[PDB]
Amino acid sequence: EPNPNRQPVELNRTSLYLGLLLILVLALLFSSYFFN
Amino acid sequence: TTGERPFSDIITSVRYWVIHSITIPALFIAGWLFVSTGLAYDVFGTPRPDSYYAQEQRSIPLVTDRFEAKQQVETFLEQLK
Amino acid sequence: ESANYGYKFGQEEETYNIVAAHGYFGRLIFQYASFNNSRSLHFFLAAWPVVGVWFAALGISTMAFNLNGFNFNHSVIDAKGNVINTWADIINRANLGMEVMHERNAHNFPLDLA
Amino acid sequence: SEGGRIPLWIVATVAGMGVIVIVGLFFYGAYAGLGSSL
Amino acid sequence: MEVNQLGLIATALFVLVPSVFLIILYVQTESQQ
Amino acid sequence: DWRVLVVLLPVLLAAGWAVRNILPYAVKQVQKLL
Amino acid sequence: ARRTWLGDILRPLNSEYGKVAPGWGTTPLMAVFMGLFLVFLLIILEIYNSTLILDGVNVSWKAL
Amino acid sequence: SYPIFTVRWVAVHTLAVPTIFFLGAIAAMQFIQR
Amino acid sequence: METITYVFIFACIIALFFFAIFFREPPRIT
Amino acid sequence: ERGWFDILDDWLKRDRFVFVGWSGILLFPCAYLALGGWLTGTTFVTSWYTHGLASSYLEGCNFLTVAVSTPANSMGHSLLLLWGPEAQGDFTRWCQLGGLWTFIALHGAFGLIGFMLRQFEIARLVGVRPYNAIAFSAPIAVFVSVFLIYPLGQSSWFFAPSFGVAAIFRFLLFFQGFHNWTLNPFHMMGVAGVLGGALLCAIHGATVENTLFQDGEGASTFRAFNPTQAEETYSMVTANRFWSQIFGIAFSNKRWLHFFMLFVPVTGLWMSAIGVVGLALNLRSYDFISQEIRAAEDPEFETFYTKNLLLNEGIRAWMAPQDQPHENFVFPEEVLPRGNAL
Amino acid sequence: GLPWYRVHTVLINDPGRLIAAHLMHTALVAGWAGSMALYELATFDPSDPVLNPMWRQGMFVLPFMARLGVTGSWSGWSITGETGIDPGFWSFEGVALAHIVLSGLLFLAACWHWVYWDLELFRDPRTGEPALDLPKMFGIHLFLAGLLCFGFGAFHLTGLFGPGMWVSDPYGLTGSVQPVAPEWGPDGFNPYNPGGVVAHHIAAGIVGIIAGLFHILVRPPQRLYKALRMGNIETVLSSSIAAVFFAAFVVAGTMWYGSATTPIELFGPTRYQWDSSYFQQEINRRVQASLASGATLEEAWSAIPEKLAFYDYIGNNPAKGGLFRTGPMNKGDGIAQAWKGHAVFRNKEGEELFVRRMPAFFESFPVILTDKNGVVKADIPFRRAESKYSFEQQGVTVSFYGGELNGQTFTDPPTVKSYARKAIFGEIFEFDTETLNSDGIFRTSPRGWFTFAHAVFALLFFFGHIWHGARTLFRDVFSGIDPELSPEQVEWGFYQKVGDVTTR
Amino acid sequence: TITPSLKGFFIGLLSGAVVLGLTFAVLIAISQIDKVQR
Amino acid sequence: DIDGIREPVSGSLLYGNNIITGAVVPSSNAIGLHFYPIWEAASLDEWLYNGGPYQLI
Numbered sequence A: 001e002p003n004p005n006r007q008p009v010e011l012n013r014t015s016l017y018l019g020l021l022l023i024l025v026l027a028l029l030f031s032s033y034f035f036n
Numbered sequence B: 001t002t003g004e005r006p007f008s009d010i011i012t013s014v015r016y017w018v019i020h021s022i023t024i025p026a027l028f029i030a031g032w033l034f035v036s037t038g039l040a041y042d043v044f045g046t047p048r049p050d051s052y053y054a055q056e057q058r059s060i061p062l063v064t065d066r067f068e069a070k071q072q073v074e075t076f077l078e079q080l081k
Numbered sequence C: 001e002s003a004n005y006g007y008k009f010g011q012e013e014e015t016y017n018i019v020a021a022h023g024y025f026g027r028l029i030f031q032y033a034s035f036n037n038s039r040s041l042h043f044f045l046a047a048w049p050v051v052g053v054w055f056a057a058l059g060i061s062t063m064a065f066n067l068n069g070f071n072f073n074h075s076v077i078d079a080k081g082n083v084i085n086t087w088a089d090i091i092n093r094a095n096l097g098m099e100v101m102h103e104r105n106a107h108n109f110p111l112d113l114a
Numbered sequence D: 001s002e003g004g005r006i007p008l009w010i011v012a013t014v015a016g017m018g019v020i021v022i023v024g025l026f027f028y029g030a031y032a033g034l035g036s037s038l
Numbered sequence E: 001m002e003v004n005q006l007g008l009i010a011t012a013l014f015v016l017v018p019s020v021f022l023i024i025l026y027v028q029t030e031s032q033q
Numbered sequence F: 001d002w003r004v005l006v007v008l009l010p011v012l013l014a015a016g017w018a019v020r021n022i023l024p025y026a027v028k029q030v031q032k033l034l
Numbered sequence G: 001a002r003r004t005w006l007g008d009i010l011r012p013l014n015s016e017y018g019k020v021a022p023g024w025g026t027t028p029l030m031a032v033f034m035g036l037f038l039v040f041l042l043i044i045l046e047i048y049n050s051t052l053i054l055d056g057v058n059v060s061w062k063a064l
Numbered sequence H: 001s002y003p004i005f006t007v008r009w010v011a012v013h014t015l016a017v018p019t020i021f022f023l024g025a026i027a028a029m030q031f032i033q034r
Numbered sequence I: 001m002e003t004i005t006y007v008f009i010f011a012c013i014i015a016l017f018f019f020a021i022f023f024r025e026p027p028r029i030t
Numbered sequence J: 001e002r003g004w005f006d007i008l009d010d011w012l013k014r015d016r017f018v019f020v021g022w023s024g025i026l027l028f029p030c031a032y033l034a035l036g037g038w039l040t041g042t043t044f045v046t047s048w049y050t051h052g053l054a055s056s057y058l059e060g061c062n063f064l065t066v067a068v069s070t071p072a073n074s075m076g077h078s079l080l081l082l083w084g085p086e087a088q089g090d091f092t093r094w095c096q097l098g099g100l101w102t103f104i105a106l107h108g109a110f111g112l113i114g115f116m117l118r119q120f121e122i123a124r125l126v127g128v129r130p131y132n133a134i135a136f137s138a139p140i141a142v143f144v145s146v147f148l149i150y151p152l153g154q155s156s157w158f159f160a161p162s163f164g165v166a167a168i169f170r171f172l173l174f175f176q177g178f179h180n181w182t183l184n185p186f187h188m189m190g191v192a193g194v195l196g197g198a199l200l201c202a203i204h205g206a207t208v209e210n211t212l213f214q215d216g217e218g219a220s221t222f223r224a225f226n227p228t229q230a231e232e233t234y235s236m237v238t239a240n241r242f243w244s245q246i247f248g249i250a251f252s253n254k255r256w257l258h259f260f261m262l263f264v265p266v267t268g269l270w271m272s273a274i275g276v277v278g279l280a281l282n283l284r285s286y287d288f289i290s291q292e293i294r295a296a297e298d299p300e301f302e303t304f305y306t307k308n309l310l311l312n313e314g315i316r317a318w319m320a321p322q323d324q325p326h327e328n329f330v331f332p333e334e335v336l337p338r339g340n341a342l
Numbered sequence K: 001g002l003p004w005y006r007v008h009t010v011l012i013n014d015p016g017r018l019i020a021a022h023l024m025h026t027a028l029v030a031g032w033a034g035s036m037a038l039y040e041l042a043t044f045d046p047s048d049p050v051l052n053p054m055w056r057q058g059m060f061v062l063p064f065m066a067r068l069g070v071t072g073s074w075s076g077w078s079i080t081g082e083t084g085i086d087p088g089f090w091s092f093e094g095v096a097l098a099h100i101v102l103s104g105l106l107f108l109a110a111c112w113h114w115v116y117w118d119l120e121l122f123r124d125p126r127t128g129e130p131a132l133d134l135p136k137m138f139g140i141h142l143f144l145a146g147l148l149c150f151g152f153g154a155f156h157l158t159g160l161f162g163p164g165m166w167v168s169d170p171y172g173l174t175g176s177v178q179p180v181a182p183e184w185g186p187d188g189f190n191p192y193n194p195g196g197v198v199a200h201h202i203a204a205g206i207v208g209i210i211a212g213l214f215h216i217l218v219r220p221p222q223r224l225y226k227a228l229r230m231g232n233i234e235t236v237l238s239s240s241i242a243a244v245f246f247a248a249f250v251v252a253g254t255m256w257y258g259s260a261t262t263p264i265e266l267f268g269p270t271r272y273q274w275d276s277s278y279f280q281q282e283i284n285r286r287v288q289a290s291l292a293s294g295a296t297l298e299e300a301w302s303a304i305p306e307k308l309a310f311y312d313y314i315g316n317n318p319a320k321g322g323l324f325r326t327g328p329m330n331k332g333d334g335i336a337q338a339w340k341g342h343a344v345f346r347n348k349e350g351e352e353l354f355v356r357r358m359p360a361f362f363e364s365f366p367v368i369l370t371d372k373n374g375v376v377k378a379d380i381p382f383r384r385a386e387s388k389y390s391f392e393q394q395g396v397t398v399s400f401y402g403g404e405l406n407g408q409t410f411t412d413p414p415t416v417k418s419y420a421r422k423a424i425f426g427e428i429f430e431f432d433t434e435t436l437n438s439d440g441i442f443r444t445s446p447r448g449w450f451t452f453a454h455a456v457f458a459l460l461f462f463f464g465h466i467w468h469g470a471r472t473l474f475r476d477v478f479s480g481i482d483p484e485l486s487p488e489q490v491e492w493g494f495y496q497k498v499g500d501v502t503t504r
Numbered sequence L: 001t002i003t004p005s006l007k008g009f010f011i012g013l014l015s016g017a018v019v020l021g022l023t024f025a026v027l028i029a030i031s032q033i034d035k036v037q038r
Numbered sequence M: 001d002i003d004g005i006r007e008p009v010s011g012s013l014l015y016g017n018n019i020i021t022g023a024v025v026p027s028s029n030a031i032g033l034h035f036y037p038i039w040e041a042a043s044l045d046e047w048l049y050n051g052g053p054y055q056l057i
């Protein structure tokens, strides 16, 4: 039987841009320390 | 409004000033005397200008033991002649 | 759903209740420390950091001409004339470490005048 | 007695002047006695 | 320069895993009517 | 200590004074709330 | 829903949802234990902190 | 019409009374000489 | 290797600027 | 069921000039005691026996140099209760041993707890969401990590910040010299959050003030607003176009805008908090190992990183003996790191 | 649809799948413990518990296995230096394997509970809706926890039926797993008395059983049920998160300060042992005792165990590392090979001089030598031109007693200076820096990393508690406030009591 | 044995109890005198 | 050579810097406040040694 609690998930484009910018800036910041 | 008398109402009343033209100077003078009598020094254990050091000493009376700190300070105060 | 979808770009009506926010913050402190005028509030938001950063900038720009921070080095002296250190003097010690180590090969004469 | 007799602007003025007196006293103290470096 | 060589993969994964996460979420959002 | 009475005396005279001036209205408020 | 043997066995353990005691119930009692617990914590903190020093309790590696 | 002694009264004076006392103390300090 | 990494990340960020600016969700008045 | 609890609840939540509430029972004494404690200390109490410093108005310090200083290093992490084994009920000794520091820090901690409970309580009474409290989590994280966790990681309370302007400056310089704290990416995120916050504050405020609708005739635009009006007082659409054309991107969602204004500084402060928790253990972002290997081998290799390390070494050597009197550092002139001439 | 940060909220009214998710989490954590143990066992060098114990090697879970009595490998070695032992099944490998298998079983169970989510058990008998009776659930789980706690204390720790636990002497020289008797007196609350650990689990276990029976049999009062929203599982999330960051701060603290459950042979020394020269004092005490009994300097110092000397060295201080200085301590100063012996510095006049030890605060520290009275007698100058205390001027020599350099004296300034530089770190060791390509820079121990991770997680979880607590108490306004909020409910004086419309 | 610090502990305990007790006694008294109107 | 004492400071990634340590280094102290455009240099190599890019930027 199909579970009635299932919900669709969303991520709009602006959230994609924001998220990508966060990940990339965090990488740009921490990478020096990873290489050390 | 929350029911209390408005501040502007009170601080422009003659009575407010009858009371506070007394109570405020009195407090001021009380504090002044608290210092001028030297009471503050003894209450808080703050050194007077002539009691940071013994006359020839240049070392700080630094507390160096946790449970004997009180005794240390008292000893330091003794060594001030 | 995201609460943000409750706002639609260009809608004529406000998306929050400024009277509720005012009632809340006004009770948080007291009534007369809370803005009830959005214009004067937003103006405050604008003015405070802008004026502050103006002062920071003027700080750098005036220290450019060596009108420097407060100097209380050895400001407190006991009855005999012993220096009683304050936190200002500790700061001075740290400042000295910086001064003596900075550009370690560039100074030939005892004062770093620029 | 009845609130409203003494005009607010006079109160404000006297108060402000008191503030200036006391703060002036503190700045004077920066140059005399303790903490004056002398 | 004697950098820690793991830095490379650490950085790569740091970028790729969450980025890919977002991309999956975005694309399947667009493909919904 | 004499300095304690010297320092407390102005404040005590102040309290006594404000009590003198405000007492009737004070008992009026206390009675009113009761 | 689907019944199972284990489900039927456990069924009464999950059947009193929302059942409450009226009013304040055992809240006073609870409060007491909380009070007690607080003091207990205070004690073990202050022992660890050397703010409370007890005979025979040497808060050090040199305990044993 | 209005009460004199309220929560606000108490809050105001717990801050105001020590403040004037302290201002007197610090004012006095300005005349201390080493 | 590190240099390539740093410059790569940077380059991605600039590319991202391009897309976020010119290929943004259009604000639509309603 | 109107028992005493409910009557008390009635009284505590009366709409008065200063709201009290249940939280008020915790908030008001603690806050009051912290404030009074700082005012008392900075006015009257010395740091002679704990730091070898004058720190009060009574001693001749001014507003910038007064402080309630931390206890002596010898106290360890003692609660320094007035009735505790160090002061033994002696108020004066307690003041001289640094009791006011733990007094202020602890009453201050519980005060902050009280304030945030107050935010929750009032939020619940009025019917708003508790985002203000949530936002206030960030100051609490900062306070707790810097004033409690950080010294708890170290040898004693002595190395916590002392409560004063110059004392805090010293704290900053210490963190540079010993911890190389500016190099720490968690601090960096904090800086980004705080400056980003200030930036958002300015830019949102200015944008609103410069996209106002003419809703009045006067040259003072402040009058042309009514708290109960339904219409927006400024044009989001014009704001959006302006920023889209000036800067490339712009907000289009107001809820998202104000959430973002919540998000940036709160998150920044939380990040700095994490970094300081690291510094409690001296788990620093002090060096870049590759830089040090190269520089050790290659005396012509210089960067701003190595330059700053030379500065840190100076800070440590020159400030340690006076800043850490209990250590009894005697550093002869000849061992002090110095560049040429200076 | 759901924003990315709410995807897991689909479980809130689905007990079966909530259980599936919890099962999956448990499987993941068990699998991590297994994998982590296997990695450590693949990298652990068991060949020298004296100068290369587990905490020098970056071992994180090995010490937690050792702490509770797993000390042996199937390959025949044990962490206390024995060879030819049979640890039975419950070796490090056996523990790792059991966790891996548990992980697989929990994975399968998670699948089953995911697919068969619609169980009658999760429905309320009266309403037919999904419902969990959280108060009774709490009673049941609390009772089980009480049982487990009690059993752990009474059987495992005591050795009644189990190995006991890691105990040691005050200097962490002779650690082993031993049965521990409960301490029922006030010293039971001494964090350094392990008897207290035992007593705690027995007593708290019984209390847990009693309390559990109580929460099984006695319903919540209406007023607490309402106040805490006990019908809402998120209230349990909030208070559980609170308990958990509480616990986290406590284990961070006891890991940093030390206790009977964080032994130095398993996690390394504490920073405070360096701060107070804990080990140096015991070393000196033993040496003084030998000299008292007529032994020579060389005898007195050669009698000092290398293990004890190794504790008295700042490279084992957990407050000396760095956030991005990764890996085992061996990667920093090297793999310790041997004590060089105790360095005794002397000047031309034959006075004994003492190197000022490095405080943990300093990445670097000058080399300064005093006499017993703390008077500076020699140093390594920065500016040479007005040097008065140079080793060359002062004719400083170093002699070694004990260790590989026993009986030797060095008189050439460069050598003497080398040893003085090492002497600021405490006792001096020979390190193999080649094997690991060690870079010479200090790293922290498992004590450090544990403490850091758990202080940070405790702090973040505080925020978790705030967030979920807020969501529990403000569920009605989560999506926003009442569009018909009366301006007079929020304006002043309209109601006597804030928020109470019956007080207008 | 009652060490001086155990005594100190009891004094702190009793002080706290007295502070809280007086506070709540006053609060309850005032609450009972100045009731809200419904 | 930021401070003009023939002691060149490395600022670029290719010359041993990471994102955190890297910089465009201020022009040489020997230049002071003199205007140093590219065409005042005898070569680009000179210009680079003396920190011309800082001024241009």
Ligand code: CLA
Pocket (backbone or CB within 6 Å): G035, G036, G038, G039, G042, J025, J026, J029, J030, J033, J079, J080, J081, J082, J083, J099, J102, J103, J104, J106, J107, J110, L010, L012, L013, L014, L015, L016, L017, L019
């Ligand atoms: C109202 C809120 C409040 C809170 C949360 C605090 C909290 C604190 N105070 Mg502050 N204080 C307050 C108000 C408050 N204070 C007020 C109004 C004053 C003025 C009187 C003070 C004056 C003051 C001083 C002078 C000092 C403190 C100190 C402290 C700290 C130690 C407290 C302690 O150990 O008590 C322990 C007591 C309790 C926890 C009471 C619990 C009662 C239990 C639950 C009931 C059982 C009691 C039982 C019947 C007693 C049996 C006794 C018998 C065995 C002999 C703690 C941070 C100390 C400090 O800051 O050290 C640095 C300190 O020296 N406070």
Ligand code: CLA
Pocket (backbone or CB within 6 Å): G041, G044, G045, G046, G048, J144, J148, J149, K183, K184, K187, K188, K189, K190, K191, K195, K196, K197, K199, K200, K201, K203, K204, K207, K208, K245, K246, K249, K250, K254, K259
């Ligand atoms: C009857 C015999 C008996 C004995 C001998 C013990 C012995 C012990 N108990 Mg147990 N206990 C018992 C019965 C017993 N218990 C019973 C019947 C219960 C009721 C179920 C408990 C409930 C209990 C709890 C809840 C705890 C103990 C703990 C302990 C240990 C205390 C030593 C220590 O390391 O404290 C260390 C811990 C403290 C000194 C308390 C810390 C309190 C914190 C500081 C409060 C503030 C938290 C705050 C959020 C921190 C954030 C601020 C910060 C970041 C600055 C010791 C093993 C403690 C423990 O396990 O420690 C490892 C502990 O937390 N016991």
Ligand code: CLA
Pocket (backbone or CB within 6 Å): A026, J267, K039, K040, K043, K057, K058, K059, K060, K323, K324, K325, K326, K327, K328, K445, K446, K449, K450, K451, K453, K454
């Ligand atoms: C409680 C957690 C914990 C702790 C305390 C340890 C401790 C240890 N590990 Mg173990 N480990 C763990 C969990 C843990 N581990 C987990 C979950 C895994 C699986 C990945 C491992 C896998 C593992 C391996 C493979 C190895 C270790 C090793 C070690 C040892 C060296 C540690 C080191 O160099 O770290 C370095 C720590 C850092 C560089 C800090 C990381 C800081 C992060 C990246 C910050 C992230 C910031 C974030 C993006 C900010 C977001 C902001 C945004 C929200 C706005 C040390 C004893 C090593 C060892 O010596 O083995 C013998 C080793 O080789 N561990």
Ligand code: CLA
Pocket (backbone or CB within 6 Å): K004, K005, K006, K007, K008, K009, K237, K241, K460, K461, K462, K463, K464, K465, K467, K468, K471
């Ligand atoms: C027992 C622990 C626990 C549990 C069961 C939950 C459960 C929940 N949280 Mg809460 N939360 C917790 C702790 C917990 N939280 C803590 C410690 C914090 C502070 C950081 C929060 C802060 C928080 C916020 C701000 C929000 C939630 C929300 C939620 C709900 C939706 C979660 C979701 O879909 O994320 C989905 C997450 C992802 C799809 C990716 C997350 C990637 C993270 C950031 C990095 C990866 C972590 C890594 C894989 C695992 C590390 C393990 C670590 C413990 C060592 C769900 C009920 C949301 C909610 O209330 O919805 C209504 C919500 O907005 N939580």
Ligand SMILES: C=Cc1c(C)c2cc3nc(c4c5[nH]c(cc6nc(cc1[nH]2)C(C)=C6CC)c(C)c5C(=O)[C@@H]4C(=O)OC)[C@@H](CCC(=O)OC/C=C(\C)CCC[C@H](C)CCC[C@H](C)CCCC(C)C)[C@@H]3C
Pocket (backbone or CB within 6 Å): C028, J030, J031, J034, J035, J038, J104, J105, J107, J108, J109, J110, J111, J112, J115, J132, J133, J135, J136, J138, J139, J143, J162, J163, J164, J165, J168, J194, J197, J265, J266, J269
């Ligand atoms: C130094 C910087 C700084 C100060 C002085 C500060 C101050 C304040 N923040 C408040 C609020 C906030 N701050 C917030 C976000 C931030 N706050 C920030 C930084 C600061 N915030 C930053 C960077 C952020 C971004 C995230 C939010 C979201 C709020 C609020 O909602 C709240 C507010 O109402 O603002 C209007 C108020 C809390 C009132 C209160 O707790 O009363 C109770 C007083 C108590 C409990 C006493 C505290 C005792 C302290 C902790 C220790 C003792 C300190 C001494 C008395 C003085 C020492 C002085 C020396 C150091 C020089 C208060 C005005």
Ligand SMILES: CCCCCCCCCCCCCCCC(=O)OC[C@H](COP(=O)(O)OC[C@@H](O)CO)OC(=O)CCCCCCCCCCCCCCC
Pocket (backbone or CB within 6 Å): C043, C046, C047, C050, C051, J205, J206, J209, J210, J219, J220, J221, J222
């Ligand atoms: C008159 C004093 C000027 C002080 C410096 C400038 C402050 C105002 C500029 C902030 C720029 C923010 C960005 C634009 C934000 C923006 O668009 O503003 C808009 C806002 C409202 O504009 P209106 O058009 O309604 O009024 C301005 C004119 O049109 C005249 O009606 O302007 C003002 O309120 C001007 C206030 C003048 C009086 C302000 C006095 C403030 C200083 C008080 C003393 C503080 C000293 C502290 C020292 C420690």
Ligand SMILES: CC1=C(/C=C/C(C)=C/C=C/C(C)=C/C=C/C=C(C)/C=C/C=C(C)/C=C/C2=C(C)CCCC2(C)C)C(C)(C)CCC1
Pocket (backbone or CB within 6 Å): D019, D023, H014, H015, H018, H019, H020, H022, H023, J032, J033, J035, J036, J037, J038, J039, J040
């Ligand atoms: C500690 C302690 C305590 C408490 C005490 C208290 C509570 C106190 C209070 C105190 C106080 C409460 C004080 C106050 C003071 C104040 C002051 C000192 C003020 C000053 C001010 C001024 C000087 C001003 C200035 C200004 C500004 C700021 C801005 C505007 C302008 C002007 C210039 C006006 C007890 C006994 C419980 C116990 C023991 C310990």
Ligand SMILES: CC1=C(/C=C/C(C)=C/C=C/C(C)=C/C=C/C=C(C)/C=C/C=C(C)/C=C/C2=C(C)CCCC2(C)C)C(C)(C)CCC1
Pocket (backbone or CB within 6 Å): K028, K029, K030, K031, K032, K035, K100, K101, K102, K103, K104, K105, K107, K108
């Ligand atoms: C099926 C089956 C089986 C098997 C099983 C298995 C094979 C398992 C495995 C499992 C596993 C093998 C698992 C693992 C896991 C792991 C994990 C889960 C991890 C995680 C991690 C993390 C989460 C991390 C994070 C981080 C990072 C990355 C960085 C730093 C920071 C941190 C820490 C945050 C058997 C035959 C038995 C039986 C039944 C069936």
Ligand SMILES: CCCCCCCS[C@@H]1O[C@H](CO)[C@@H](O)[C@H](O)[C@H]1O
Pocket (backbone or CB within 6 Å): K074, K075, K086, K087, K088, K089, K090
């Ligand atoms: C699922 C496959 C895993 C099988 C591994 C079983 C190891 S069994 C293990 O073997 C050791 C051999 O020296 C013995 O010392 C030990 O007593 C015995 O329990």
Ligand SMILES: CCCCCCCS[C@@H]1O[C@H](CO)[C@@H](O)[C@H](O)[C@H]1O
Pocket (backbone or CB within 6 Å): K333, K334, K414, K415, K418, K419, K422, K429, K430, K431, K432, K433
């Ligand atoms: C000229 C050097 C003569 C004295 C030897 C130096 C002090 S001792 C030396 O210290 C090294 C760390 O730098 C260790 O790696 C090595 O094992 C140890 O022999």
Ligand code: OEY
Pocket (backbone or CB within 6 Å): C102, C103, C106, C112, C113, C114, M003, M029
């Ligand atoms: O800091 Mn000090 O003072 Ca202004 O110059 Mn003189 O030495 Mn150098 O050139 Mn860069 O810096």
Ligand SMILES: [Ca+2]
Pocket (backbone or CB within 6 Å): C079, C080, H034
């Ligand atoms: Ca004189």
Ligand SMILES: [Cl-]
Pocket (backbone or CB within 6 Å): C101, C102, C103, C104, J307
């Ligand atoms: Cl420099």
Ligand SMILES: [Cl-]
Pocket (backbone or CB within 6 Å): C106, C107, C108, C109
């Ligand atoms: Cl010069």
Ligand SMILES: [Fe+2]
Pocket (backbone or CB within 6 Å): C042, J204, J208, J258
């Ligand atoms: Fe706004």
Ligand SMILES: [Mg+2]
Pocket (backbone or CB within 6 Å): D028, D029, D030, D031, D032, D033, D034, D035, D036, H029, H030, J060
């Ligand atoms: Mg003066």
